[PDB]
Amino acid sequence: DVVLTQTPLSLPVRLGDQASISCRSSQSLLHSDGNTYLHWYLQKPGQSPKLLIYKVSNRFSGVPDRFSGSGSGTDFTLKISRVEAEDLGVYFCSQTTHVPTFGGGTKLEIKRADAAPTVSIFPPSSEQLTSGGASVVCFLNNFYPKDINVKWKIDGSERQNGVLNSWTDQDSKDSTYSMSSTLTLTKDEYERHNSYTCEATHKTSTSPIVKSFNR
Amino acid sequence: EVKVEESGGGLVQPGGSMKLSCVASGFTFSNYWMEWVRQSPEKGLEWVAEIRLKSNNYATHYAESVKGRFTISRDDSKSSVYLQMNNLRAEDTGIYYCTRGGAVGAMDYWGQGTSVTVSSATTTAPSVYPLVPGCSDTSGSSVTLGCLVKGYFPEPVTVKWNYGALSSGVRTVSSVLQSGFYSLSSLVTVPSSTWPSQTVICNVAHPASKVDLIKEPSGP
Ligand SMILES: CO[C@@H]1O[C@H](CO)[C@@H](O)[C@H](O[C@H]2C[C@H](O[C@@H]3O[C@@H](C)[C@H](O)[C@@H](O)[C@H]3O)[C@@H](O)[C@H](C)O2)[C@H]1NC(C)=O
């Protein structure tokens, strides 16, 4: 088949700045009829891919003049000037000269100003207790960069196992992230202790953002 | 104005069968070739099949990997195109998109997609617990509420608030697979006045089990 390799794999870019995605194929995409069917697509979080550029450089309908494409042999490039929030997502290149193939994709991330997190701690709901486990959730909302560390303390003692951390995709509006840390204990483990504390350490601070509840 | 909508996904065993449907609207369906493209986290986007026009005797073309197992067909009168899948394998797992063969030489319009999971593990509907304030002082954008969706399989699960009416400041982390099950969280932030005075509920949908779960977070 025709292989399409895209670079970079991840692309951090500032608002209003310029981004450049490349796509290289394993063979020539020039068709006998003289056209080159290399296209670009944008896939936003949760949404399906949308066509931006067709036949190397033709912009699709509604596609702003900020998106432009070019080609040269087996090398192709997608360019986005004046990058803006709504531009985040994964850009793919694809060809239809031969059996259709797609590139691996390039995630475009919005490099924005740091934002300190807002912490909320939710003790377990009594509705969960009969499951045999209890989940204490520490929600860190609207922060940036993505990197963050959450530590859990049960009655002063740090607890490492039983924790599951997961992030949201970058927000289309303010370009921040949110993440939740979930500490899951056996029901009785949870009742043999009274103070549950989660400490979050983010680039936006030295002192840990602490949130805790007592039963 | 061009609209494409697929359906028919879910969990299947290996080597079972499954049929997907796609309904288009907004354009003279009969004048265009139609495609099926799937996306998996193991092989990324992969073209599966194509079916041309009436004048073309509905010529069909399949990717080498599905040739002899998948069959694509269309019905110009009802503006639909289908994908019959047999002897499914774990590799066939992924999101399947229906797309139009654009006049411009590329697949121009894609549907939202429908997920397919080929596995020997069975379906498990999610359990939903309320995430409530946790009784504290207002110091984090005014009150944050949420729904903890645990123990479901397979993916995906969609979460909405107030049936979609509430969409500002909604945050949903991605799922994580552990102990053989997925789980995620979805939280929303609202003014400490518009609650509990007003009604806030989360709508958790799980296609594979065809369940829609509606839960309202009360002060409790
Ligand atoms: C091996 O040739 C390629 O086979 C694929 C699988 O059947 C086709 O998807 C692919 O077609 C291309 C181009 C097609 O656009 C129409 O046909 C071309 C020739 C015209 O130039 C154009 O104006 C349209 O009428 C498009 O719909 C599909 C999705 O991709 C085919 N390659 C070519 C170059 O035909």
Side-chain angles (χ1 to χ4, degrees):
Chain A
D1 282 56
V2 182
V3 163
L4 298 182
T5 298
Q6 304 186 210
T7 66
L9 192 50
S10 173
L11 210 183
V13 69
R14 297 156 178 164
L15 290 176
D17 232 301
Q18 328 113 76
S20 183
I21 302 209
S22 64
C23 176
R24 170 173 293 180
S25 46
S26 54
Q27 54 177 276
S28 105
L29 302 174
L30 174 56
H31 186 270
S32 294
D33 77 2
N35 297 293
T36 303
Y37 302 85
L38 187 285
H39 326 290
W40 290 91
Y41 293 84
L42 165 53
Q43 174 171 43
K44 299 192 181 188
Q47 291 173 34
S48 71
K50 287 175 189 175
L51 174 66
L52 309 173
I53 302 292
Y54 67 89
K55 281 172 168 191
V56 191
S57 55
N58 303 291
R59 284 183 284 104
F60 191 58
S61 289
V63 181
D65 53 299
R66 304 190 289 104
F67 295 96
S68 76
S70 60
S72 177
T74 60
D75 301 309
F76 304 81
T77 296
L78 173 65
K79 191 171 173 199
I80 323 177
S81 58
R82 338 172 219 300
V83 167
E84 55 185 65
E86 285 298 322
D87 287 354
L88 81 190
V90 185
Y91 293 79
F92 296 102
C93 58
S94 76
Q95 60 79 27
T96 50
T97 285
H98 316 286
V99 174
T101 51
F102 295 82
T106 295
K107 171 137 297 177
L108 190 106
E109 158 164 31
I110 304 298
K111 186 68 175 54
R112 58 148 287 165
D114 292 4
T118 281
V119 182
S120 301
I121 197 175
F122 305 94
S125 175
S126 60
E127 291 174 51
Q128 168 173 42
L129 301 186
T130 50
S131 66
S135 295
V136 193
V137 178
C138 186
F139 179 62
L140 307 68
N141 192 37
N142 306 139
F143 60 95
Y144 183 96
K146 174 180 182 181
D147 312 85
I148 197 163
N149 295 42
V150 183
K151 214 63 64 60
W152 284 91
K153 284 181 179 179
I154 298 176
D155 284 343
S157 305
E158 171 179 282
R159 227 257 180 175
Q160 290 178 58
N161 67 88
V163 187
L164 255 179
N165 307 137
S166 185
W167 285 247
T168 59
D169 271 285
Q170 185 161 38
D171 180 278
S172 310
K173 189 180 191 190
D174 59 288
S175 312
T176 55
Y177 292 78
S178 290
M179 78 85 73
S180 61
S181 177
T182 308
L183 172 54
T184 306
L185 307 160
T186 57
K187 179 190 172 178
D188 52 342
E189 179 55 64
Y190 177 65
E191 309 180 321
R192 281 199 299 277
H193 298 277
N194 178 269
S195 283
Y196 292 84
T197 299
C198 61
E199 302 179 6
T201 290
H202 187 231
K203 173 183 182 179
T204 58
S205 183
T206 290
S207 55
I209 300 184
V210 175
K211 255 296 189 303
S212 62
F213 75 88
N214 296 181
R215 311 163 60 225
Chain B
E1 298 173 287
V2 161
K3 186 179 184 174
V4 182
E5 184 167 292
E6 317 88 332
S7 49
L11 172 73
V12 185
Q13 307 175 185
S17 287
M18 171 167 261
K19 181 167 189 172
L20 310 179
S21 308
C22 171
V23 181
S25 74
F27 65 102
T28 293
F29 189 81
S30 74
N31 289 345
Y32 298 90
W33 297 352
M34 291 303 286
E35 315 279 346
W36 274 101
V37 180
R38 70 182 177 191
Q39 169 169 43
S40 67
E42 293 52 45
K43 296 168 180 168
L45 292 166
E46 197 179 324
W47 169 68
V48 175
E50 165 188 284
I51 187 168
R52 311 200 182 186
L53 312 179
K54 181 196 183 186
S55 63
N56 296 164
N57 197 193
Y58 295 111
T60 65
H61 290 107
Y62 310 75
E64 207 59 50
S65 64
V66 297
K67 206 171 193 183
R69 296 191 295 120
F70 290 23
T71 290
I72 189 181
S73 59
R74 53 188 299 162
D75 180 338
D76 291 345
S77 63
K78 285 177 282 186
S79 310
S80 295
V81 51
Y82 316 93
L83 186 67
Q84 174 57 54
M85 308 183 272
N86 312 101
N87 314 303
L88 293 173
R89 290 185 278 182
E91 309 80 270
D92 299 329
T93 295
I95 299 172
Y96 287 64
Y97 299 98
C98 177
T99 77
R100 188 180 66 166
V104 295
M107 298 171 213
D108 51 24
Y109 291 104
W110 298 51
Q112 33 99 188
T114 185
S115 177
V116 175
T117 293
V118 180
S119 169
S120 57
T122 58
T123 295
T124 302
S127 282
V128 183
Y129 309 111
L131 297 174
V132 174
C135 189
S136 178
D137 304 299
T138 306
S139 60
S141 298
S142 301
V143 63
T144 301
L145 297 55
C147 285
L148 178 61
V149 181
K150 307 194 64 196
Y152 65 86
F153 184 93
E155 214 173 341
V157 155
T158 69
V159 191
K160 299 171 186 173
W161 296 83
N162 291 342
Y163 303 79
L166 204 306
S167 58
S168 292
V170 169
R171 299 278 174 285
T172 304
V173 304
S174 87
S175 64
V176 187
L177 175 69
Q178 193 179 80
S179 297
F181 297 83
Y182 293 83
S183 72
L184 62 62
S185 295
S186 188
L187 309 82
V188 65
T189 300
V190 307
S192 43
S193 60
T194 79
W195 194 73
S197 55
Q198 295 179 65
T199 298
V200 171
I201 80 157
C202 63
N203 310 269
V204 177
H206 185 51
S209 59
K210 308 179 186 62
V211 311
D212 197 335
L213 196 148
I214 294 174
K215 191 180 194 69
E216 62 173 351
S218 280

